[PDB]
Write a protein that binds this DNA or RNA. Sequence first.
RNA 1: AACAUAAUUAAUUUCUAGACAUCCGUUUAUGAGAGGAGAUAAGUCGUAACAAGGUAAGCAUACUGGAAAGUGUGCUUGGAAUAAUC
Length: 52
Amino acid sequence: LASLMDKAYERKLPVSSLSISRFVDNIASREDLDSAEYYLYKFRHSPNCWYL
RNA sequence: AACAUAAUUAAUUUCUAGACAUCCGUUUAUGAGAGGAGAUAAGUCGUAACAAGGUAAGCAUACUGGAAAGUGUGCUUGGAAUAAUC
Ligand SMILES: [K+]
Ligand SMILES: [K+]
Ligand SMILES: [Mg+2]
Ligand SMILES: [Mg+2]
Ligand SMILES: [Mg+2]
Ligand SMILES: [Mg+2]
Ligand SMILES: [Mg+2]
Ligand SMILES: [Mg+2]
């Protein structure tokens, strides 16, 4: 899922709300939280920030 | 070369990339040298034209000649024969 979101931001393409939802749901470790925090930041600064 | 993401406010992205390459040509200038016209203006050689200009003049064309010109063939009068009679 991380790869899918990374490609979209590189191409300046919108990311789905379902995509960020799947990431947060499948957090399995303390380290994963840190990565999700970065992607929540990226989602906020993206065209579909309102759809969180 | 023209799709793809996204969508419980709605929008993002694509909507391109080479080859502007020299032409075939066309004008004008330069002019080795070879000519033409015109004028300058005292000559030189003849005397061709103007008188029937001393071979009437001229046109076309051909040939010929220092030069004007000469000669042939056809044509012109822009020559003449001012004009009663064996
Ligand atoms: K003569
Ligand atoms: K004459
Ligand atoms: Mg004479
Ligand atoms: Mg004579
Ligand atoms: Mg004469
Ligand atoms: Mg003649
Ligand atoms: Mg002769
Ligand atoms: Mg003779």
